[PDB]
């Protein structure tokens, strides 16, 4: 499964779903697409 956004992730080892992106700035997944 994946993470929903606002959950903490690693942008290079992204575990969040697509449409959302894992932020290197916020260090968590966000909806930005």
Q: What residue segments make up the domains of the chain, in order of their start?
A: 1-33
Give the method of determination. NMR
Question: Cα(1)–Cα(32) distance, rounded to whole angstroms?
Answer: 20
Query: What whole-number distance in Å separates Cα of residue 24 and Cα of residue 1?
Result: 21
DSSP conformational letter for 7 = S
Question: What tokens does 24 get?
Answer: 């290197």
∠ Cα 27 5 21 (to 5°): 65
Among candidates 24, 14, 31, which has minimal Cα distance to 6?
Answer: 31
CA-based R_g, the chain, Å: 8
């Amino acid at each position: 499964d994946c993470l929903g956004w606002f959950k903490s992730c690693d942008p290079k080892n992204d575990k969040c779903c697509k449409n959302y992106t894992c932020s290197r700035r916020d260090r968590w997944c966000k909806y930005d697409l």
